[PDB]
């Protein structure tokens, strides 16, 4: 299956948030936002 | 694949602006990197 | 019909992947291996190519018709009439 | 009201001439149209004929009780298959009927109390002329003397009430207030036997379990509403006294709320699951009742009418495995899915209703309930939570195991879903859907 | 293995086996097609001792150590615990300490 | 027979009514073992299963009725259900003890939470200033 | 250029989110004042929320305008968006500024 | 797909042919265990266990005492998936 | 057909155990160059102590079993297709006798196969009264 | 199940039109990755220049 | 009709509105007969004070009163919550610009409203309600504001 692979890369790409996929317009933000806002340190580098 | 593109450019009005360290906004990438080092690192084994 | 079978003369323990150097690193242990010829067909070349080959047709799948159909949009942004 | 009650006596002949079981079921029918049609009450009483009235507490009380009494005669046929004594039969529900509307109607207490307690004997007919287990005489037994051993002592408190009172309209009562200390345990234990409460449970397992289809439908869709009601309409005199002693009450329900669910995940028995399940509800009910408060009073009034429906309907689906594979078992009733598909939507639709999911009228109440308790005493809510939890939880179980598991294998063939059961499980349900849309008349009655 | 033990059982609990096949093969008490299913002793027996164990129900110590704390003392404590509160609740409602702003379920 | 025909006979009190009763469920005079009859007893049911669980039964022995892992005429055990697999039951033994799956749960639970709630003391941030709102009387001075 | 130090020195890092608690010294930066552009009025008109009703809105109703009119493709409002964040980035280096200011005005009071 | 009984029977045969510690030439298909294969004690589920690993199902713990040849093994796989017809 | 006695022997409770064992290595151990390799490691150890008294035996086993408990894999490979499988027993199907209740409406769309099954059904009844002389 | 199952060997050879479309559709992937690259690389780096707490001279 | 979509919507809302307000002017004015449907203005009555210690009619005439003012009185709580309600969902920053001077009316509705109906429940009648604020006039007379304690 070179479509059901590629597709299954697609899905990765955009959970694993390589750039300009769904992960990096999402994930990215969050996680600035996450340094922007005060938080705790566990929720910090859990996060990461 | 266009992914949060669409929304991306149609959710917010007012875009959260986020001018954190380099050494911050970065560091979610290579943070990022390194599980997938991980992942097909301890996966990829030799017999003995 | 459904399929056919051969008829396991091909299948040969001497399968050069390294399953002979795994028969040498149990030669130390020198115990013997009698499944092994199971695996031939296993790994087989041209079934699957080199891991990394597999790789490289995974991860890269497209990657050059990107490249090429991206100069091409870059032509296009460029010639007619974006410019910069 | 006469109107109705002159109709069920020259429905009554009907029994002696032969071959009129499916002629007087849509007479009945009709007759509830009929009934249906007459709807324009308030609080105040209405329609005061002689010394018959009508109210939203009783006309919605009556039409439950004319809607179930004619699905009776859908439930059960094999009384014609067999043929039974059909005749006796028609004639005891119809007596029954008729004991019924004179009981909701009654706008004096003792003449509620007289065909309360009149009511005694047709169902201990309609249990007895259709038995099939041998448990059948104790059963009886049971039942009329856990009865009768409460049910006659507040004959004393009604000619107490009198000869303080001067009369027993409703009315009358609620002008004035009792706080004897026995007048208060003598009416309320008295009925709260056969609302029923979880320490005299006892009998209504046995009830259920050894009586037929019919029996058990009118045992589960009426007696214990009749009870509510009856209290709905005498509490209004009790308070003081009750305020002083109603901790004790609300903990037995609570309480045995979820003990009785305990009971019913290890019971083993379509009817006995129903049967505590069917006092789960009503202890709740007695809860929110005994409560006083205007949101649990309208909302008891609500939960009884939703609780009869959907325990006639799971009775009727006991009936069904009961006639198909001729034991009320789990073990031997499983995976019927694979023999009624469509009826096992039935099957789940009616254990919906039992677990509150909407639209649903039963589920309207619970939340009337809730709140009144919870406004009661903060307290509750720490059993509430369990309450309803291990509610859904039996009756998940009761739906999965009866309906899912691999076939049995000894199992001899028996004839499939047919449109007298099919029609009959719709009638039960889709009115418990209907009356959302205009509860206000069954959600407004103080 | 006992010698035989597993043995003993064998023969005459697989003689029954057959009888089992021969009731569900029935082609003739399936014929009648009126329902029912085989006899099964098991499910007899577990139906009478479901419904009656009183007549062994023995009033000892046991029994009542276990329903005491079964039921009992948790209605006991749990009405208790509810009157309690609701007496300094209602205590301090008819002394009209909380006047009737602050007071909550104001529409029950 | 109906339900009061079968009704189980009380706690056999001599080998005599042990061999009856063994007899009278199917059981070997061994495998018949009745029940403590204490106080709460059935009396002569017998005292079968009670294991770990019924699906550590034979998983592909022949079975009368699959669906219980069951064979024909036998005891049903008093309390079938509680060890049903469809209720509490497994098919191995377990790797550990009780107090080790609560423990190994709970103990982390708690210690994570103590130890964040002393990290929330020291809540971390970026060091900028606070959020200036436009409002009467508010003069924040500029950079200039 | 962390937080960790707080813990060390609760009293030395001002904390989070703090005002100005020395701006009087005007020896220093902060001599003149905020400007309003967008009036409130416009403002409330404009809906935009309370969170962001702050020094940076005129171009934020700028933006609106900008969508509203060509709101099928947004991506065309690109500019818009490209200065209104620059308005709110010059923001943020006065909110840096006056952080290190009031430590500024801190630390030189701090001994003494 | 279905399933065929003549290939059921040389695929046992192939994963027999392939099977070192078996008698190379794989003597009469009939070939009993213990008689000409010499299959030991334990070398008697290793046969076992690669047929269930080629044929997608464990066999029973004692109903491989059962399957005492490759004709055997046949019977099980047949009595499995209807290969009789 | 016959159901076997349950009756077992030290040999079969030390064979079925390198059948466990096997399993518990598939379960920790994967690649199939792997695999072989670590299970004739294992086979050694099968094979060091081949034949030994009984006793040592009965402590053979007290150690064995100890070994694949305590090491194993919390997520065995259960098998696809076989009892305990991931989706094995997705579904069930009823006794004939469901297929006998169809209305003759439903009767009249396979009539060559109802016919074929009134046939077969007549000769079961045959085959019944054989099976035990009735 | 499927009308293609081999035994011990590779996938049965798939026509090239099934071929053109996974790698099409991996194709598509990289086309608007590097498509967005160019037109936005600043944008994995933060927009903005960070300026430093030291560097800002004390007026 | 700057924006594009919007100026499309617009066609759709064209498009559905087109049809029923034809439907109105064509097959209702041309169908329709005219007739009137006032509204209750139920007389006072004399309350229980009025009535007499055994009445039973006045007493009933009393109750139904009493329930019928229940009944608006219930409701009055009810519209000025819809009324809150629309002011709350005005605009988005527009919160606090009129909860409180909006709201506080119906804050004080609630208390009033408790006061002559609340903490009776159902089967409350004029007399326990009347007798209610007898106590209370009592109570205010001679222990103080209830919210006080005792002296
Ligand atoms: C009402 C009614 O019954 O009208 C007939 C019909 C239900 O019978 P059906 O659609 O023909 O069922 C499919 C076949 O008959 C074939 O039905 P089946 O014999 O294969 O059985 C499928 C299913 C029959 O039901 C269904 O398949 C789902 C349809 C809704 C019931 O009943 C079952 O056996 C499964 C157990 C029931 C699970 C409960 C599913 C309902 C959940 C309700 C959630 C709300 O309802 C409708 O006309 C429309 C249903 C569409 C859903 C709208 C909600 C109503
Ligand atoms: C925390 C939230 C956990 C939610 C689960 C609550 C426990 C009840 C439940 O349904 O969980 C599943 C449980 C076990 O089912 P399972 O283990 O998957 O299979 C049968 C194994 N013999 O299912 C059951 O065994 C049914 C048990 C009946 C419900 C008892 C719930 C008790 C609640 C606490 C006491």
Redesign the interface.
Known sequence: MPLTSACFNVSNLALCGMPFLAGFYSKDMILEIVSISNVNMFSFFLYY | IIGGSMLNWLIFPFPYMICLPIYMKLLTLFVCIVGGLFGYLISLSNLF | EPYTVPHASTYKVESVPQLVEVKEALGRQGLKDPWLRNEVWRYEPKAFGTHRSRLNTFLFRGLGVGFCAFLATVAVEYALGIGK | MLKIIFFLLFLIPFCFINNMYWMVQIMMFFISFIFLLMNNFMNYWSEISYFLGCDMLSYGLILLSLWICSLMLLASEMINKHNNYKNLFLLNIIILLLLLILTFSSMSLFMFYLFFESSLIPTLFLILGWGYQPERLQAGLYLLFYTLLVSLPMLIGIFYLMNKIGSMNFYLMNNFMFNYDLLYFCLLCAFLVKMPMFLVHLWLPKAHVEAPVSGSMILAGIMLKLGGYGMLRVISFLQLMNLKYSFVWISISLVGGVLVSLVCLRQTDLKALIAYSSVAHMGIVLSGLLTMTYWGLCGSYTLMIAHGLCSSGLFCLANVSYERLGSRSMLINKGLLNFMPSMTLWWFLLSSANMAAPPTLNLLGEIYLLNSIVSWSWISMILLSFLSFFSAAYTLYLYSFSQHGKLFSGVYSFSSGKIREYLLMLLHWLPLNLLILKSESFMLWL | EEQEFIKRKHEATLKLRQEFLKQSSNPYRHATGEGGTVFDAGLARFQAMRVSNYEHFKPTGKSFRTGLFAVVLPIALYAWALKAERDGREEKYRTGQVAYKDRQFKFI | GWNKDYKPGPYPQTEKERLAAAKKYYLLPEEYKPYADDGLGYGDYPKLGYGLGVEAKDSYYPWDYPEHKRNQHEPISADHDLYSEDRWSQAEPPRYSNAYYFACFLGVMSGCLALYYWLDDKKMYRPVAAKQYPSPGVKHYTFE | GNALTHYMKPDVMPGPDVVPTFDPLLGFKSRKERVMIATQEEMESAKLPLEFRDYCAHLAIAYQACRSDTFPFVYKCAHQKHEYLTCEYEDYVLRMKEFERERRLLERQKRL | ????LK?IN??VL??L?????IDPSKLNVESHFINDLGLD??D???V???MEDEF???I????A??LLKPADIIKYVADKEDVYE | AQVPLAIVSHKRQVCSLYKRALRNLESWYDRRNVYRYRAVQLRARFDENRSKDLGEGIRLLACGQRELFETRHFQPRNFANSAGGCAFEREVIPPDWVLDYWHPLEKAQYPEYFAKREQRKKEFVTWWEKQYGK | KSHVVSYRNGPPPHSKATKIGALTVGGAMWWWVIWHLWHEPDHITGEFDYPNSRKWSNT | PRSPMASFAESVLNVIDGPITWFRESIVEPNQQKQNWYHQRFRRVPTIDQCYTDDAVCRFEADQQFRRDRMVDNEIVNILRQRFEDCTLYEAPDHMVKCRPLMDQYEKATENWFIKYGDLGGYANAKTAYMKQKHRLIWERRHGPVGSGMK
Do not use: T
């Open positions: 797909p279905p399933l065929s290939l040389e695929r192939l994963v042919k392939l099977y070192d510690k004690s334990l008697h589920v290793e076992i266990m690669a997608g199902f464990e029973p713990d004692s109903d005492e059962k």
